[PDB]
Design a protein around this ligand. Sequence first.
Ligand SMILES: Nc1ncnc2c1ncn2[C@@H]1O[C@H](COP(=O)(O)CP(=O)(O)OP(=O)(O)O)[C@@H](O)[C@H]1O
Ligand SMILES: Nc1ncnc2c1ncn2[C@@H]1O[C@H](COP(=O)(O)CP(=O)(O)OP(=O)(O)O)[C@@H](O)[C@H]1O
Ligand SMILES: Nc1ncnc2c1ncn2[C@@H]1O[C@H](COP(=O)(O)CP(=O)(O)OP(=O)(O)O)[C@@H](O)[C@H]1O
Ligand SMILES: Nc1ncnc2c1ncn2[C@@H]1O[C@H](COP(=O)(O)CP(=O)(O)OP(=O)(O)O)[C@@H](O)[C@H]1O
Lengths: 349, 349, 349, 349
Amino acid sequence: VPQELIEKIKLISPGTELRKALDDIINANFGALIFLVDDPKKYEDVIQGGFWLDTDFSAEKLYELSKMDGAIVLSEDITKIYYANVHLVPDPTIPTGETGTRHRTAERLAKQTGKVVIAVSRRRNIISLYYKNYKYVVNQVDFLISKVTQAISTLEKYKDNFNKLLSELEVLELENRVTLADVVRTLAKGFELLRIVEEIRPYIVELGEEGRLARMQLRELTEDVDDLLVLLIMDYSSEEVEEETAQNILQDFITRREPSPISISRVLGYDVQQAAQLDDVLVSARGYRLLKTVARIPLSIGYNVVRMFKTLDQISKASVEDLKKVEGIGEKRARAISESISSLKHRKT
Amino acid sequence: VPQELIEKIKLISPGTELRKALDDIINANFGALIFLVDDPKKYEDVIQGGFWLDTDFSAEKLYELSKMDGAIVLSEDITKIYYANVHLVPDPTIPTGETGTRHRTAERLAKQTGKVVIAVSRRRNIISLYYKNYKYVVNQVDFLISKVTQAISTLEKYKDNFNKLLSELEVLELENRVTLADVVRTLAKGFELLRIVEEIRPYIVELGEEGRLARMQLRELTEDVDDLLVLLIMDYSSEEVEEETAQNILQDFITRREPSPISISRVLGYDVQQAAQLDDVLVSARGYRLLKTVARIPLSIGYNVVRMFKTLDQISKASVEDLKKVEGIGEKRARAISESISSLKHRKT
Amino acid sequence: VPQELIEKIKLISPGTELRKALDDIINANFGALIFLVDDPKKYEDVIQGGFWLDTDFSAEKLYELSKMDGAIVLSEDITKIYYANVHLVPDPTIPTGETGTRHRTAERLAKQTGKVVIAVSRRRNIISLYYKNYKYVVNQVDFLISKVTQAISTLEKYKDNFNKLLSELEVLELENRVTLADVVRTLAKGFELLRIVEEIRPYIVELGEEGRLARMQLRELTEDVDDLLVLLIMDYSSEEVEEETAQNILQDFITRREPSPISISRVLGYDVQQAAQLDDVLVSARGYRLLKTVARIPLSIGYNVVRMFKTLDQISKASVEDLKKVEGIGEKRARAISESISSLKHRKT
Amino acid sequence: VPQELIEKIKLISPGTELRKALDDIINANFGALIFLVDDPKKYEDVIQGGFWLDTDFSAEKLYELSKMDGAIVLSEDITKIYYANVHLVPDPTIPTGETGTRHRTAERLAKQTGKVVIAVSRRRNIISLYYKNYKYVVNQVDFLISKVTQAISTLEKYKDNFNKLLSELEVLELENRVTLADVVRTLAKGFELLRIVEEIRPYIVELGEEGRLARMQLRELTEDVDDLLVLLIMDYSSEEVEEETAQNILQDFITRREPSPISISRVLGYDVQQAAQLDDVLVSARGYRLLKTVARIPLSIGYNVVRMFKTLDQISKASVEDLKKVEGIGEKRARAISESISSLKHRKT
Ligand SMILES: Nc1ncnc2c1ncn2[C@@H]1O[C@H](COP(=O)(O)CP(=O)(O)OP(=O)(O)O)[C@@H](O)[C@H]1O
Ligand SMILES: Nc1ncnc2c1ncn2[C@@H]1O[C@H](COP(=O)(O)CP(=O)(O)OP(=O)(O)O)[C@@H](O)[C@H]1O
Ligand SMILES: Nc1ncnc2c1ncn2[C@@H]1O[C@H](COP(=O)(O)CP(=O)(O)OP(=O)(O)O)[C@@H](O)[C@H]1O
Ligand SMILES: Nc1ncnc2c1ncn2[C@@H]1O[C@H](COP(=O)(O)CP(=O)(O)OP(=O)(O)O)[C@@H](O)[C@H]1O
């Protein structure tokens, strides 16, 4: 969904004066045919008849002008109403896949001029927007809120299961009993959770102002999940990896690649073939996840701690004095790490 | 609900071009009478008048043809529109339980020809589908989403209570203090939970594309519940039972048998008569549930471990060396079992 | 809301053939005036004109007969349609508080004859039922489901807070650090929770078949709450009390009395005046709640255990041998009590 | 939103007889123009024609009078209907921003007379209320319930995250490992949570009777949150602060100031500039939060305990005898504090 088109779609999104008028028009069962031009002078040949207005835009004006037949002509920035009641005459040899004169006209004209054309039928309560060769249908808020509410509910359940997986893995991590299965399983649920988010984003966008609460709900459900998955990947990849690499793996099981168990493990540097094999692969976390998240050690200095101790299991045994021997951590960070890890082990075991 | 009928119902399910047209037709308060034929030549005697079209199907075409009186005739695969505006003349001595000419015609014709006949009244917003001797009413998405959302909410609350029961039983299992009451109670809630799922499945099906999120929500709520109940049954049945047997018991308190306390215990091999008696019946888990779920030991090799130690209580005491004496578990699986059980006992006690 | 009236209301509740017809009638904006008689012969003087039918009832018939003006006459059991298109002529000197001829007629006739009269206006989508001197408005399912869904959500939040209170009190109970404030607070939330349930019950009833899922949701949210509050009251009342007494106290803060802190404590046998005073009142549970709920000791034998040890704190210290000295508990129940209490103390402390 | 206006808005809020009539009027697509006067004699010059009624108000009467053209005139207390079918003639030189004669009339008249004028269009289902120079649009319950339900869902997710933050901080507080980051983070989420509540309050108000359940849901979600944040602020401010001061800080990140990390810490008496700096700032709670909340020690006497021991870490080490040396706490309060803190440390560590 190209961003040029996305700019256009915000023109008719909930919260704009234009959408308020369109909403009223829909509610009244007037139709609508709106041509978004910037230099009205130049479209002289596709505009016939009607009334030259050159007046300031407003929702009420647009509404009232919609009671008349034919099309209305607006400035691209929706600040001026140029014409009402016009007959729009695009080239009829232009191919169109639309039904009925209103939408065939709108599609042809949008392709011929590269401008925006908005079309609303009298009966159907749907806003179709034609721009160049695109066509985007904009839904009513009723419909959007319902799909978004379903999705957020869906997200909740993924998040719960992700939290269960994660706290289970936490026990295993502190006890150095982690298998590749435990990691891959946790990652997969995280990946799926963020995917759902990706899938619903266009709806959130289509909701405009009306999607303020949904945006907040998403953010609460997912805020630290990206960072968390990136740290898991860093901690359990077969060979070490920079933040940026891991960050790109995350980026990908969310978009280009589907996250199957075998897929994730292979991408993690493990040569595996079958499901049942993952339970037999033992792995130890380098310790980045707890160092950043719990010990609040910058991932900057994290590497230093890892390169000295290699794994979280070692780090958990290090004395303050031992830990202090690392560069990037002094007296304060030493106690932060040992007390963090010591506290977690005594509480989750 | 026969599967032949089920195939037919997906023809008009959300996501098909046909349903999109039907939806628009409903919204416009046109009626509809649609005859799904494959060899139009052969129904010459039940089709009079109207227009021979033989044109490619589309939702917009079907919509427009619906503005006219009478019936429309489609190919069974919904790729061709054969007729519009026809008078359909089925045998009127065929018994019908329908009201008004449209639905009496549809029922009679569907029985006479064994084909599909779709009928939509102008006022009522409901799709009736007649096929042979069946009649299936298809609901609007509005109505389906509401019932499904209620059911998922219902499921949530069953799942919570099931989780509470289960984690309570977990304590009891690790401490070898389990009574038949604790088991039967846990099982019953699981059974009821899966039943609700069974009850709502037709609605999920009727939702078609529009039920993608509900499917995902169900799966998250229930994924490992079947396996879990099967393992409980295996662990607490009076005499030992194969996976397949237990799997069939589960299959049944979900469908053919209602899961009362006494019922479940009797089916579990315990000769009991009264409720209050179950609290006095002491039972010990063989250990399959934790061996598979937590120790990630294949149920294959599980039996071997059980047959040697008889119960989870024994298994929890076995040394690695002891455990290693079992066939099917080596050095890795030994530590997996003892560390698993050791970890759970120290955390839940 | 008298039960005679309640029987009548189920006549038009979701799931009945009558309601299905009424629903369709509402959707069509026909009006309706329905007179529920058993001996049509005897109402000769309040029924003029129209058509004598004496036909079997059905929803479709009732619908079709509703297209005509005037009233329809049914048998009380809704098995026969006696008249259609009649003019109903009740005594006009009977006082009525209704507007417009349809509802004035319905109210007067219902009072004059003590029978049921159903009235539906063409515009408004509401079912009014007159019977004797009663008038009950029945709402659409749309409206009911929304209020019930709000209430269940409300209930959820009360239940969560009740669970938090309760598990907090559990810690305090095991450590013998309970004050009257802790008890009263817990009880109050329980009382409020069950009250909400009481408040919504008429809506659940009005929902008929359509309220199956809401009934299940309520039951899951509240199943063991009554028993739990009754046990709290038994455990923390100033003087000992039978089950039945406590059961009646519960029954009352739900209905006749509003449950303020001071109120509940005074009803609990504590002479208190001010809020802040409750924190200073130390109390110890007799131990009924854990004996029944956790030790699965019948409240029958519970008393015996209490009368010997007086409090849960004592009971928690008793040896098996000590406990066995009680009548009603043998070897099995002794270990059940000591292991129960021992397990809880080690897990919640 | 001035309170004079707020009084007026409750006139047309769900639950009033007036709103019931307005609702019916909307449902019937009658328009409405209602003038709320107390001394009808004095508005002789802005009221022409129509019928002098001087009758008692009722919803049904108002409805019926709405079938006629023109305006209706009511007493300010909505107890009398004075006129119907009148032509209202306000000064037309009064500036108005409304469209169409009904709403231009209503705005002008409301400004000219300082009285209330209610206007309802035939098509649009919206109630506009003009009073003096104000204009308030009142929404349908449908619309309000949807926004409120979204907000409560939003609140839930903030509350969960706030609870997680808080219980995490609890561990840190008992172990004396708290940094300014931990405090500021917790506070911020609390602040944001109460803000959302502030944002939705007008909707709750607009819901009138129909917002009983939403009010209860809010109260359950937020009851002890204000007190909790006030105690955090008291416990972690750089210099000591009275209840009232802290209570005013809370009051402010909810309203006048946006709660950024740096903002909150600076307002907390810490001279910080950058985000990353907060993790390095070590802080110890004075102990007010646990003393009040858990030890149920009045904040009155709290200060005394603090001024002697300075921090929660000290207090946690004090003997009963030590603690008893404080004024305001005797034998009972000593054991309350040491047992409280002792219990929490053993359970959360
Ligand atoms: N080239 C054109 N220029 C200006 N206005 C046009 C136009 N083509 C159509 N319209 C306007 O759209 C009206 C008819 O378009 P239709 O395709 O029939 C939309 P509709 O009738 O509302 O859809 P419907 O099928 O859901 O009822 C015309 O009467 C006209 O006012
Ligand atoms: N044998 C038949 N063949 C073709 N079309 C038929 C038909 N019988 C009925 N129809 C179509 O259906 C129309 C009337 O059927 P009705 O039973 O009255 C449905 P309706 O009027 O929409 O239901 P309603 O009672 O909810 O208003 C006819 O006018 C016709 O166009
Ligand atoms: N005594 C009576 N006997 C039989 N039918 C009656 C009746 N009184 C009224 N009716 C039926 O009800 C119709 C008018 O009643 P109204 O009070 O106007 C209901 P309505 O018009 O649907 O309510 P509305 O104000 O919402 O529009 C009459 O035309 C008649 O068919
Ligand atoms: N000064 C005035 N005094 C009394 N009544 C007035 C009035 N001005 C308008 N009205 C009433 O309002 C009616 C027309 O007002 P409109 O602005 O057209 C509201 P509407 O038509 O319902 O809005 P709409 O644009 O959504 O359709 C008049 O016919 C009149 O009955």
